[PDB]
Amino acid sequence: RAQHIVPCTISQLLSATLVDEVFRIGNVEISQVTIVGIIRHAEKAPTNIVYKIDDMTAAPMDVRQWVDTDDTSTVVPPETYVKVAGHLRSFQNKKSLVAFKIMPLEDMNEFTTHILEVINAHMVLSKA
Amino acid sequence: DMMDLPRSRINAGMLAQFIDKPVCFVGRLEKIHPTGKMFILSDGEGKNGTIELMEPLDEEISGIVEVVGRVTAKATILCTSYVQFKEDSHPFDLGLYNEAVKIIHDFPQFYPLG
């Protein structure tokens, strides 16, 4: 009942259905996801930051992040490849992520790796 | 403005099979036309794909380049956008990136093609 992180493509997030606040792919539910993509745009909102993050699998998805401007423990620039860990969300039928970490990739071999992780993770659920 | 479409990740050998489709092509910069309006990339099995631009490059390009564009009737790519990969820590293993591509096209159901 806790706590599982499924690596995903943005299109996999789009394909997920929402019944009574529960997101499902097949008979399996999430919640917590990682994706890897590029920051296309970055807005400063009143209470947080809205990134548009593009993995090539669909149109960019909105991802909200919170930052403490008196800390480095600062907006990631556009054109950056980024790993994202967050929770899947939906308001008024619009999918988006709520992020807990946004780690810029210094080694793009992590991006290759993530693809394989996506693929194997969904081979696994598929069998459930 | 194909930034809101799915873009298949492909190697050179699938250019023919993706004519007219939006694509994302990763390879190593082999050569640049004197005009800056086309250049060549090689993928992880040493195959070439020709990339074309409506306007000349702004800057030097080298190493691994990730190009987004539409595959042309002649199996070329019209570049809409590109990003240069950095390799400050570890060099990008292009060969395994190519293995990863093959896998995407063998299992579209697990890397939903958008």
UniProtKB/Swiss-Prot annotation, chain A:
Keywords of the record: Acetylation, DNA damage, DNA recombination, DNA repair, DNA replication, DNA-binding, Isopeptide bond, Nucleus, Phosphoprotein, Ubl conjugation
Post-translational modification (record): Differentially phosphorylated throughout the cell cycle, becoming phosphorylated at the G1-S transition and dephosphorylated in late mitosis. Dephosphorylation may require the serine/threonine-protein phosphatase 4.
Up-regulation conditions: Translationally up-regulated in response to DNA damage (at protein level).
Biological processes, Gene Ontology terms: base-excision repair; DNA replication; double-strand break repair via homologous recombination; mismatch repair; mitotic G1 DNA damage checkpoint signaling; nucleotide-excision repair; protein localization to chromosome; regulation of DNA damage checkpoint
Superkingdom of origin: Eukaryota
Chief subcellular location: nucleus
UniProt DNA-binding region: 33-104
Example GO molecular function: damaged DNA binding
Subcellular location: Nucleus; Nucleus, PML body
Keyword DNA repair applies: yes
GO cellular component: chromatin; chromosome, telomeric region; DNA replication factor A complex; nuclear body; nucleoplasm; nucleus; PML body
Family, per entry: Belongs to the replication factor A protein 2 family.
Physiological role: As part of the heterotrimeric replication protein A complex (RPA/RP-A), binds and stabilizes single-stranded DNA intermediates that form during DNA replication or upon DNA stress. It prevents their reannealing and in parallel, recruits and activates different proteins and complexes involved in DNA metabolism. Thereby, it plays an essential role both in DNA replication and the cellular response to DNA damage. In the cellular response to DNA damage, the RPA complex controls DNA repair and DNA damage checkpoint activation.
Subunit text: Component of the replication protein A complex (RPA/RP-A), a heterotrimeric complex composed of RPA1, RPA2 and RPA3. Interacts with PRPF19; the PRP19-CDC5L complex is recruited to the sites of DNA repair where it ubiquitinates the replication protein A complex (RPA). Interacts with SERTAD3. Interacts with TIPIN. Interacts with TIMELESS. Interacts with PPP4R2; the interaction is direct, DNA damage-dependent and mediates the recruitment of the PP4 catalytic subunit PPP4C. Interacts (hyperphosphorylated) with RAD51.
Name under which the protein is recorded: Replication protein A 32 kDa subunit
Organism: Homo sapiens
Encoding gene, per UniProt annotation: RPA2
First-to-last residue of the parent protein present: 42 to 172 of 270
From Swiss-Prot, chain B:
Keywords assigned: Acetylation, DNA damage, DNA recombination, DNA repair, DNA replication, Isopeptide bond, Nucleus, Ubl conjugation
InterPro entries per UniProt: NA-bd_OB-fold, Rfa2
Superkingdom of the organism of origin: Eukaryota
Molecular function (Gene Ontology), one example: single-stranded DNA binding
Subunit structure: Component of the canonical replication protein A complex (RPA), a heterotrimer composed of RPA1, RPA2 and RPA3. Also a component of the aRPA, the alternative replication protein A complex, a trimeric complex similar to the replication protein A complex/RPA but where RPA1 and RPA3 are associated with RPA4 instead of RPA2. Interacts with BRIP1/FANCJ via the RPA1 subunit; following DNA damage they colocalize in foci in the nucleus.
UniProt cross-link Glycyl lysine isopeptide (Lys-Gly) (interchain with G-Cter in ubiquitin), position: 21, 37, 86
Alphabetical list of CDD domains matching this protein: RPA3
Name the record gives this protein: Replication protein A 14 kDa subunit
Cellular component, GO, one term: DNA replication factor A complex
GO biological process terms on file: base-excision repair; DNA repair; DNA replication; double-strand break repair via homologous recombination; mismatch repair; nucleotide-excision repair; regulation of cell population proliferation; regulation of mitotic cell cycle
